[PDB]
Every structure is written in structure tokens, then in C-alpha cells.
Amino acid sequence: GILELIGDYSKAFLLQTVDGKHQDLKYISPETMVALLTGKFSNIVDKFVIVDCRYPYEYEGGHIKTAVNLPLERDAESFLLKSPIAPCSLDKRVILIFHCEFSSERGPRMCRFIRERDRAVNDYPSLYYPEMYILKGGYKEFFPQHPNFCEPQDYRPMNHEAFKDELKTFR
Amino acid sequence: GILELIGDYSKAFLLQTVDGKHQDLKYISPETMVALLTGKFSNIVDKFVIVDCRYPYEYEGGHIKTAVNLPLERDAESFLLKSPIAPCSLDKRVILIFHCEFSSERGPRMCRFIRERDRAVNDYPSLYYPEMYILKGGYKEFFPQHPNFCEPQDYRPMNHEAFKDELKTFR
């Protein structure tokens, strides 16, 4: 029912979803992420942003193509809400996809934060980003199945030994 | 019952195990792999070999420390059975651990193959390698959790686009 309705209750979620940890959030599989990246929804989706919520060194060691790195809430808020990324056609959808390494904590968290700020600067139902998803499994599950959609085509875990300082510096 | 006994039915499996796909095989977690690598079983385990059953390009892009790359059955048979890696102390055990990228196919098969060859060159209960395990999740699960125990500290998936020919060649 209303379970499939997006942020402004105007319509159902466009993408097929899968079971995820957080019940209040919608999850998509690596496969759906590829379909989106290869234009299978080009007539319906006007724009989509992939928000890598991992820290800079993780992102720099290999991320999904076109993804933007926004680890801090102020960065995310600034990039997504200071100057709202509207559609080139008010008939088309704008979709946001969040993920981190495992898409367990940092990702889902950033997703809720943005929804809060979005509600704050709008007239209740209306949202700049009514449709948002979490990439299930994060980079850890996506990279090995579709390395060709990543760049550089590598993977640097948050636990990587050569960035322990950068890690706590970011904590 | 005999399910908890090793190949020659002489004693129980030394390492704690976890549920894995193949019921005929014993699986260990990344955590147990680390305990073994850091000497937590040095008084009981005389020697252990980690057999990376992935293809050379995968191995070269990042593998577990001390692991040997034996993708082909002839390589594995030659390295492990042409000149049996016996213990320095008869009281001590020799353990083998197989894994591939996800540890669902290549690794388990190599593990079964070696057990067959081992049975072939012995008097029934006896085996050169009575105790063997599968690293659950393979390199995919181990690398992100313990990158410091891998070298180079990177990850090259079997699907890495720049190695499509080598994959075919090895197929």
C-alpha cells in the first residue's frame, strides 16, 4: 500500500527493491544499480546521484562510476540542498542512491539525515528528493560483481592499514 | 559423530567451524584464519598451507599472506602430493585451508580433488592431509575485514575487465 509511496506520497517507488536491514528504507541490488547506470530507466529517470558516504581515502581507492563522495553531513547537505538538483523535465524523476562499504551504517544514516533536512525546507509533502535508496551490500558487494563499473577498478577497505590515521582523523 | 572426526578418523577437527554450503566440508571464519596466522595454535598445529585456488591474475592482485596459488589440479597435486608436506613433530598437525574468491566453487572442488588423490596413495584410514578446511566467503570476505593480512593489500576480482582473455585462457 502506502509502503510503496515515495517521500511526497505522489507515486510508487520506481525501482525493484530487496530486503534490507532498516525497514524505513528502500534497498536495491547491485544488478538494479547496473540497470540504472546503463540507461534502462533513461525515459523515466531524469537524473540520479550516487552518494558514496565512505571516507575520502576509501572513495579514492575505488568507487562506483559517477558517484560523489560526501562523508560529512555538512558536505551532503551543501551539495544536495544548498542548490537543489531539479529535473530537466518536471515530468521525470530525480533519484538518490546512498551506500558505504557494507551499506550498513554510514550509508543509511546519511540517507535519513538528508530526508530530515529536505522536510525542513519544504511544505510537508513536497520534497526535493522524495525517492531515495540504499545500495544493499555497499561497495563490498558491488565491486566484485561489477568491477567494470568502478574506478579506479580497485577496492580500499575502511580498515586498510596504510590509512589508520586518516580513519580516526575522520572519526 | 564421525562428522566431527578428521580424514583418518584419529581425532576431532581442531578449529572451530561455521555453517557452509557443502555439508561434506568444514568451514572456518576469517576470524579463525587470523588466529591461525597469528600463531594462536602454534603448539598444536605444526604447519598449515593456505591454497588460493583462484587464477594467477586474481592471486597477483592481492592474496592472503603466505598463501600459495594452485589453480590447476595438476599444480595442486604436484605441490601437495608429489612430496608430502609432513609435520616436524608427529604429535603436531598439518592443516590445509582452501579458498577462492567467494569460496563456493573452485576452492571446494580443489579440496575434494586433493582428498581423492590422498586416499589413492594411502592405506585406507591414513591420509597425508586428514584435516582440511574451506575459508568461508573466500578472499571477498577476508580482504575487507583483515586487509593487513593480505599482500599486495588490494583486490582483483575474477571479473576484472582488463583480464577477460586470461580468464578465458584459464577456462
Domain boundaries defined on chain B: 1-171
Using CA atoms, how far apart are residues A152 and A38, in angstroms rounded to an integer? 18
CB B152 within 8 A of CB B114: no
Asked if residue B46 lies in contact with residue B63, where contact means CB atoms within 8 angstroms, the answer is: no
Q: Do A156 and B155 contact (CB within 8 A), yes or no?
A: no
Tell me which residue of A18, A15, A9 sits closest to A103, measured CA to CA: A18
The nearest CA of chain A is from the CA of B153 a distance in Å of: 8
- Active-site residue among A53, A100, A111, A150? A100
Relative to beta strand B150-151, strand B63-64 is antiparallel
Find out whether A69 and A106 touch, Cβ atoms under 8 Å: no
What does the alpha-carbon distance between residue A163 and residue A159 come to, in Å, rounded to a whole number? 8
Supply B114's cell numbers: 586433493
- Burial of A89-102, coded b for 16+ CB within 10 Å and e otherwise, reads eeebbbbbbbbbbb
Asked whether the CA dihedral A145, A151, A153, A157 is positive or negative, the reply is: negative
Cross-strand bridge partners of residue A63: A151
Active site residue A100: yes
User: What residue in B sits closest to A157 (Cα-Cα)?
Assistant: B144
Q: Which of B102, B147, B161 is the closest to A160 by Cβ?
A: B147
* Chain A with chain B: Cβ pairs closer than 8 A: 46
CB contact burial B64-86 (16+ within 10 A = b; e otherwise): beebebbbeeeebbeebbeeeee
A1-171: CATH class: alpha beta
Q: Is B36 helix (H, G, I), strand (E, B) or coil?
A: helix
If phi over 0 gives left and psi between -120 and 50 gives alpha, with beta otherwise, what is residue A39? Answer: left
Which residues of chain B have a CB within 8 Å of the CB of A161? 147-148, 153
Q: Backbone phi, then psi, for A50, in 5-degree steps? A: -110, 115
CB B163 within 8 A of CB A153: no
Give the Cα separation of B17 and A63 in Å (integer).
34
Q: How many CA atoms lie within 13 A of A105 on its CB side?
A: 3
Which amino acid belongs to residue B112? R
Bridge partners (DSSP) listed for residue B12: B5
Quick one: closest CA in B to A158, which residue? Answer: B144
**Helix (H) and strand (E) counts in chain A:** 6, 7
Which chain A residues have a beta carbon less than 8 Å from that of B155? 143-144, 154-155
**What CA–CA distance (Å, rounded) separates A74 from A82?**
10
Most A CBs within 10 A among B105, B142, B143, B155, hence the mutation to make, goes to B155
- Do A130 and A7 meet the contact criterion of CB atoms below 8 Å apart? yes
Residues of B in contact with A160 (CB under 8 A): 147, 153
Q: Say what the resolution is, in angstroms.
A: 2.4
Q: How far is Cα B4 from Cα B13, in angstroms, rounded to an integer? A: 6
The answer to whether residues B31 and B37 touch, using CB atoms and an 8 Å cutoff, is no
* Residue whose C-alpha is closest to residue A64's, from A3, A140, A135, A149: A149
Neighbours of B42 (CB within 10 A): 10
Contacts of A140 in chain B (CB under 8 A): 140, 144
What is the Cα–Cα distance from A129 to B129, expressed in whole angstroms? Answer: 59
Contact residues on chain A for B153, CB-CB shorter than 8 A: 160-162
Picking from B144, B157, B162, the nearest residue to A157 by CB comes out as B144
- Element housing A63 (H / E): strand A63-64
Task: Give yes or no for a contact between B58 and B11, defined as CB atoms under 8 angstroms apart.
Answer: no
Measured CA to CA, the distance from residue B105 to residue B36 in angstroms comes to 23
**Angle between the A106-120 and A73-81 helix axes, to the nearest 10 degrees?**
50
From B148's Cα to the closest Cα of chain A, the distance in A is: 6
Interface of A with B (CB under 8 A): 101, 140, 143-148, 153-157, 159-162
3-state secondary structure of B159: coil
H helix intervals, chain A: 30-37, 56-60, 73-81, 106-120, 138-145, 164-170
Residue contact A147–B159, C-beta within 8 A: yes
Q: Count of CB atoms within 10 A of residue A87's CB?
A: 12
Element (H, E) at A68: strand A68-69
The strands making up A68-69's β-sheet, listed across from edge to edge, are A27-28, A131-135, A93-99, A45-52, A68-69
Write the DSSP symbol of residue B149: G
